[PDB]
Scaffold this active site. Structure first.
Site, short mmCIF file in Angstrom:
data_model
loop_
_atom_site.label_atom_id
_atom_site.label_comp_id
_atom_site.label_asym_id
_atom_site.label_seq_id
_atom_site.Cartn_x
_atom_site.Cartn_y
_atom_site.Cartn_z
N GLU A 118 0.83 -1.20 0.00
CA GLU A 118 0.00 0.00 0.00
C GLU A 118 0.88 1.26 0.00
OE1 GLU A 118 -2.91 0.33 3.13
OE2 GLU A 118 -3.91 1.99 2.25
N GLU A 261 -2.63 -3.99 7.04
CA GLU A 261 -3.73 -4.97 7.13
C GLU A 261 -3.80 -6.06 6.05
OE1 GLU A 261 -4.02 -1.65 6.43
OE2 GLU A 261 -5.71 -1.40 5.00
N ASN A 262 -2.67 -6.52 5.55
CA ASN A 262 -2.70 -7.46 4.42
C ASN A 262 -3.54 -8.66 4.83
OD1 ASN A 262 -0.39 -6.00 3.03
ND2 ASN A 262 0.67 -6.85 4.84
N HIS A 294 -6.82 -1.99 15.19
CA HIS A 294 -7.00 -1.25 13.93
C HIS A 294 -6.77 -2.17 12.74
CE1 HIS A 294 -6.67 2.50 11.45
NE2 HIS A 294 -5.95 1.71 10.69
N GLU A 295 -5.66 -2.90 12.67
CA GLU A 295 -5.42 -3.77 11.51
C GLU A 295 -6.45 -4.89 11.43
OE1 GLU A 295 -3.59 -1.97 9.80
OE2 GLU A 295 -2.52 -0.92 11.33
N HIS A 298 -9.71 -3.60 9.98
CA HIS A 298 -9.66 -3.42 8.55
C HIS A 298 -10.11 -4.70 7.81
CE1 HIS A 298 -8.08 0.41 7.32
NE2 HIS A 298 -7.00 0.30 8.05
N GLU A 317 -10.02 4.35 6.24
CA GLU A 317 -9.19 4.79 7.35
C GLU A 317 -9.95 5.59 8.41
OE1 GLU A 317 -6.62 3.48 8.08
OE2 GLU A 317 -5.92 2.76 6.07
ZN LIG Z 1 -5.58 1.82 8.64
#
Ligand SMILES: [Zn+2]
Ligand code: NA
Ligand code: NA
Ligand code: NA
Ligand code: NA
Ligand code: NA
Ligand code: NA
Ligand code: NA
EC number: 3.4.11.2
Length: 867
Positions: A118, A261-262, A294-295, A298, A317
């Site tokens: 990203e 966040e893969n 957070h990840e 996502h 986001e």
């Molecule tokens: Zn993020």
């Protein structure tokens, strides 16, 4: 010199890729990538396929196994002509992970190989449709040396493995969910692995695997714990379960941002994974929790529904930040979370919104998309999602989440899709509200009030305006949810009503000017205005000191109590900065010091709240009170204010410091809160009488049984320039020099020191045994902290800070442009400073503008700043 791209230029791709089979023959010096993609033409028959690619060595191009002749390479691209409607593309190309100092694409982290894709990093790996509205099913085969790379990881599940000649082996992975390429990941290396499991509410058993460098397994359990906490909370709060069988996290030391966040294979900066009580502070623990959450979050808000294009970044986001704040707030102290997020908004985001880089949360124009991972897109983005929540309430907001997923699960969506889901599910009209997506700058909301004792009516006249910003000459009124509470003389809430009907306390401020009238107001009220920071706005109201101290005592929400204290301090910060410019010492009314004495002695107040009230605005928050920033006056006033309060409240400070002593160390919210209070008291005490302070601080450093308390003592010794400082700083170095993450804390204290010789010391630390220009965290902890968090030294009148930053940026522009662009930010704020400083900062920017091989990343910022 790349050209700007524009949101209004969006168009559906001419070709889609539905499936991609990748093979990596991995080696640090030369990796060979084979990519077999199944493509479909959607556009015109004669439209060529345009693939993105950067720094690739093309080896071959085949279409249905025929070597293809109808192609050409251009700048950033491979353009392939004369294609059928459906076909198999095969590209073989080479890349070199070891040469990748920018850390975008496939690169080396210590002895590991890892990716960051990203926003547009997959194009540095192979020629591809590197745009997030192209979603494909990936399979990934990885071939490597078994001894150097015994773990070969990519997204999804292992479906094949083998051994080869000459000490090589391979693993193949398949991820069944279609994904944009920015969510691709690959990791190869030798790790310790912490393994655990989470069982979802419906019974899916998920294997959890956290990969860390050999020797770091002692620092992994808190991150694992937080991952389980995050999964449980997303189930309880949002109704969302994990959708795969394995959840992998890899902690890497070399990483430009925080984490990524893969799908199924998150890659984390080790700063947001590794903790134990002697290495990590309470704040590290809660940031680990935040970022792990957070990840994870996502996985739905970013992965199962992704972004149609990068102008829609805030769609994932803003919403995922909102989720991580809610997570943190639900598990921990909501008041402390809200306070901290507001400090960030007012002191850091408002500054960006008043800068040359100002943009709406959904930008209209971007040159380098890595420059738009901003306080605005993230933090303001989350405030916009929170406004929706304020306007709809939880139940309707969750209905809107459910409708968003029902419509968009498995696709790339827009900010506008999200707003429409929320509007359709709730029946709340968000058409005006949408302007928050398209307008930059911070609105200023001015409030005047009137109490009419003959009619028992209270009238609020509320006006709004947003000043023009460099990007937008035209501004219009927003839909501003403006929460109020009215307090009588005993501190009780007055019911809001008008004409015999209750009135919602969230006022809809939608016009340039409007009046709101409340009836049955039996006593002249003290208002609490913009409750819980209900919109991301500057508030202008002519408070009396007594209204503010009254709110500090009586307001029902803890946030309002803290906020009232901030408004009380703002007056006297401004007063004293003007004084400082005239050569005059600090002046503070006695009744102001008394308000803070009362906080210290109040037995009923939550210590979490007390600690925040007793934490002064940072130099960054203080700067936002002023049109023209005087960073030396601000720094000196903050210190003088700390010293004045330390003297006036000395006995009370020491008493509260001692009362909050805790022999056991726990990462538990009540304990954290006490310890924050105790250390907030220590900060003042460090600025008292010198010999007392020195003893108190040295003792805490040497007796601490946890890094939170040791660092608080060390930081206080630096800030107050105490006699013990050099000894304690040397001790920490001698003990911790081998641990980069722990030394980051020390480099930050060096960089932010008030000592007159701070720049000379910072420059000398470029040769320190724990420092290296090859590691973004080190860079940010020494150089970034100096420029961004020591504005008084950065802005030294001889211009030395600007020259130092230029030299560092001259290296980083070529080495790692993303980190360079993070570190240029303080120079682009020049128009907030006095003429003489502006002149030197412009000269510095003009020097950088002329660098050979100027990165796009820097070019974008420099050109806005010099305009
Ligand atoms: Zn993020
Ligand atoms: Na597709
Ligand atoms: Na395939
Ligand atoms: Na190229
Ligand atoms: Na909570
Ligand atoms: Na008034
Ligand atoms: Na008033
Ligand atoms: Na070094």
């Amino acid at each position: 010199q790349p050209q700007a791209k524009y949101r209004h230029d969006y168009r559906a791709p001419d070709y889609q890729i539905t499936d991609i089979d990748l093979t990596f023959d991995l080696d640090a010096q030369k990796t060979v990538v084979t990519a077999v993609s199944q493509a479909v033409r959607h556009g015109a028959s004669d439209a060529p396929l345009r693939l993105n690619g950067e720094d690739l060595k093309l080896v071959s191009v085949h279409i249905n196994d025929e070597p293809w002749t109808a192609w050409k390479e251009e700048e950033g691209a491979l353009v392939i002509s004369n294609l059928p409607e459906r076909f198999t593309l095969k590209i073989i190309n080479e890349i070199s992970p070891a040469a990748n100092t920018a850390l975008e694409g496939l690169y080396q982290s210590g002895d590991a190989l890892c990716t960051q894709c990203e926003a547009e990093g997959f194009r540095h790996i192979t020629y591809y449709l590197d745009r997030p509205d192209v979603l494909a099913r990936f399979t990934t085969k990885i071939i490597a040396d078994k001894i150097k790379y015994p773990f070969l990881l990519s997204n999804g599940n292992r479906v094949a493995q083998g051994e080869l000649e000459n000490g090589r082996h391979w693993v193949q992975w398949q991820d069944p969910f279609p994904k944009p390429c920015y969510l691709f990941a690959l990791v190869a290396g030798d790790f310790d692995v912490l393994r655990d499991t989470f069982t979802t509410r419906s019974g899916r058993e998920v294997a959890l695997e956290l990969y860390v460098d050999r020797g770091n397994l002692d620092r992994a359990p808190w991150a694992m714990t937080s991952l389980k906490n995050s999964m449980k909370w997303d189930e309880e709060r949002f109704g969302l379960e994990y959708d795969l069988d394995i959840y992998m996290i890899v902690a890497v030391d070399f990483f430009n941002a925080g984490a990524m966040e893969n799908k199924g294979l998150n890659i984390f900066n080790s700063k947001y994974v590794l903790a134990r009580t002697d290495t990590a502070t309470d704040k590290d623990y809660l940031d680990i929790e935040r970022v792990i959450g957070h990840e994870y979050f996502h996985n739905w808000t970013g992965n199962r529904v992704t972004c149609r294009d990068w102008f829609q970044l805030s769609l994932k986001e803003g919403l995922t930040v909102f989720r991580d704040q809610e997570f943190s707030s639900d598990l921990g102290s909501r008041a402390v979370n809200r306070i901290n997020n507001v400090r960030t908004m007012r002191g850091l985001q408002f500054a960006e919104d008043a800068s040359p880089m100002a943009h709406p949360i959904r930008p209209d124009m971007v040159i380098e998309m890595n420059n738009f991972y901003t306080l605005t897109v993230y933090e303001k983005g989350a405030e916009v999602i929170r406004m929706i929540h304020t306007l709809l309430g939880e139940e309707n907001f969750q209905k809107g989440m459910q409708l968003y997923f029902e419509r968009h699960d498995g696709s790339a969506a827009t900010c506008d899709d999200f707003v429409q889901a929320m509007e359709d599910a709730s029946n709340v009209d968000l058409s005006h509200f949408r302007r928050w997506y398209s307008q930059s700058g911070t609105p200023i909301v001015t409030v005047k009030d009137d109490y009419n004792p003959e009619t028992e009516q209270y009238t609020l006249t509320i006006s709004q305006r947003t000043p023009a910003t460099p990007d937008q000459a035209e501004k219009q009124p927003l839909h501003i949810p403006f929460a109020i509470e009215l307090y009588d003389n005993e501190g009780k809430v007055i019911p809001l009503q008008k004409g015999g009907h209750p009135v919602n306390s969230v006022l809809n401020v939608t016009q340039a000017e409007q009046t709101f009238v409340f009836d049955n107001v039996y006593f002249q009220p003290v208002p609490a205005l913009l409750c819980e920071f209900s919109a991301p706005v500057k508030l202008e109201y002519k408070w009396s000191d007594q209204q503010l101290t009254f709110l500090m005592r009586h307001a029902r929400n803890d946030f309002s109590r803290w906020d009232a204290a901030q408004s009380l301090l703002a007056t006297y910060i401004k007063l004293n900065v003007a004084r400082h410019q005239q050569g005059q010492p600090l002046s503070l009314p006695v009744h102001v010091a008394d308000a803070f004495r009362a906080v210290l002695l109040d037995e009923k107040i939550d210590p979490a709240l007390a600690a925040e009230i007793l934490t002064l605005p940072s130099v960054n928050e203080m700067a936002e009170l002023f049109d023209i920033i005087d960073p030396i006056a601000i720094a000196e006033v903050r210190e003088a204010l700390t010293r004045t309060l330390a003297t006036e409240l000395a006995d009370e400070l020491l008493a509260i410091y001692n009362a909050n002593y805790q022999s056991e160390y726990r990462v538990e919210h009540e304990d954290i809160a006490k310890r924050t209070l105790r250390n907030a008291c220590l900060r003042f005490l460090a600025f008292g009488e010198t010999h007392l302070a020195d003893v108190l601080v040295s003792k805490q450093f040497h007796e601490a049984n946890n890094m939170t308390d040791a660092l608080a003592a060390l930081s206080a010794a630096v800030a107050a320039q105490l006699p013990c400082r050099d000894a304690l700083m040397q001790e920490y170095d001698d003990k911790w020099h081998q641990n980069g993450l722990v030394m980051d804390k020390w480099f930050i204290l060096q960089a932010t020191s008030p000592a007159a010789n701070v720049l000379e010391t910072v420059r000398g630390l470029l040769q320190h045994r724990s420092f290296t220009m090859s590691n973004p965290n080190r860079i940010r902890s020494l150089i970034g902290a100096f420029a961004g968090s020591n504005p008084a030294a950065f802005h030294a009148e001889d211009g030395s800070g600007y020259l130092f930053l230029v030299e560092m940026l001259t290296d980083l522009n070529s080495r790692n442009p993303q980190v360079a662009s993070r570190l240029i930010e303080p120079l682009i704020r020049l128009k907030r400073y006095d003429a003489k400083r502006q002149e030197k900062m412009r000269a510095a920017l003009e020097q950088l503008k002329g660098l050979e091989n100027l990165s796009g990343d820097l070019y974008e910022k420099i050109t806005k700043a010099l305009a």
